[PDB]
Write a protein that binds this ligand. Structure first.
Ligand SMILES: Nc1ncnc2c1ncn2[C@@H]1O[C@H](COP(=O)(O)OP(=O)(O)O)[C@@H](O)[C@H]1O
Ligand SMILES: Nc1nc(=O)[nH]cc1C#CCNS(=O)(=O)C1CCCC1
Length: 283
């Protein structure tokens, strides 16, 4: 039997950088919402203990792939606590719609979907807390996807308070440039002093992304996409870019703007989701 599992994108609806820890990571205040749009991961169980990703992700080696790393990490954690039925393995395939890189979190979502699916399929019985703890070792974005709810995130992104932001419609655009996440976070001029504020304050304040000014300055393609969208709707960088999104109250308006968009915006339209499609599938 094959099972299929959603791997949704996320948006950072706002993002404030509040400081930096000694190990390099930044402490932030951000608001995660899923999109009802993303990759689909298909899994067929194996009985020989092997883990095989059958569909390569462009530019990613098999053992570097967050899909394989998640699966191996669950297998090692489960086997070390006696929670791995003998012979547990998997064949994994992905229909990948999310850009590799871009701020939509596709790789982290892939890892989270694999952790959740294989925990169920192999019957490891790991708790949400346990999966999120292992997920954090694969990326600071992974716990929000594991836990499955829109959330106000503090710390480095793993301190998650569920909130239900309005589920807007979004035109998500991908500028034609790859921005490595470390470039933004290493920039001397990145805000790392935005005051830490309460969720009420942040919900009433206009949403912004502290990384946007640097992404726009350093990558002309991002500035171009943001300038175009800003004529139609509130629009912002998500993550550290390059992806930008525009927010609409209705599906109709979002799709009309996308119809007008030059092809170099590389756009799609999707609705916000406060419950992850992964967790809606798990019901
Ligand atoms: N299954 C995967 N999907 C996407 N990227 C992956 C995957 N496995 C490893 N990666 C790596 O992670 C990076 C992209 O991660 P992703 O979460 O897509 O970033 P972003 O948040 O910028 O979209 C790439 O450098 C790539 O090498
Ligand atoms: N806290 C971090 N510090 C770093 O130095 N690197 C990565 C970090 C992370 C994280 C949680 N994911 S996130 O989406 O909220 C974040 C990633 C893109 C922009 C916002």
């Amino acid at each position: 039997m094959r099972t299929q599992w959603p791997s949704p994108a996320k948006l950072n609806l706002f993002l404030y950088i509040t400081g930096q820890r000694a190990d390099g990571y930044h402490t932030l205040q951000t608001l995660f919402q899923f999109l009802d749009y993303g990759d689909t991961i298909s899994i067929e169980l194996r009985d020989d203990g092997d883990i095989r990703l059958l569909t390569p992700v462009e530019g990613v080696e098999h053992e570097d792939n967050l899909i394989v790393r998640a699966a191996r990490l669950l297998m090692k954690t489960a086997a070390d606590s006696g929670r791995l039925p003998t012979g547990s393995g998997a064949n994994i395939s992905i229909d990948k719609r999310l850009p590799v890189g871009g701020g939509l979190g596709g790789g982290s979502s892939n890892a989270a979907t694999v952790l959740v699916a294989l925990n169920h399929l192999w019957q490891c019985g790991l708790s949400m807390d346990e999966l999120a703890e292992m997920g954090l070792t694969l990326g600071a974005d992974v716990p929000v996807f594991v836990r499955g709810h829109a959330a106000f995130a503090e710390g480095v992104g793993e301190i998650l308070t569920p909130v239900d932001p309005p589920e807007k419609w979004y035109l998500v655009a991908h500028p034609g440039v790859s921005i490595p996440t470390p470039v933004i976070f290493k920039d001397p001029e990145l805000p790392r002093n935005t005051p830490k504020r309460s969720i009420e304050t942040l919900l009433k304040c206009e949403f912004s992304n502290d990384c946007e000014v640097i992404a726009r300055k350093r990558f002309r393609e991002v500035d171009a996409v943001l300038s175009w969208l800003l004529e139609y709707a509130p629009s912002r960088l998500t993550g550290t870019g390059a992806c930008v999104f525009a927010e609409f109250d209705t599906e109709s308006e979002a799709r009309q703007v996308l119809e007008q968009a030059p092809e170099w915006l590389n756009g799609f339209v999707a609705k916000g989701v406060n419950l992850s499609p992964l967790h809606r599938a798990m019901l």
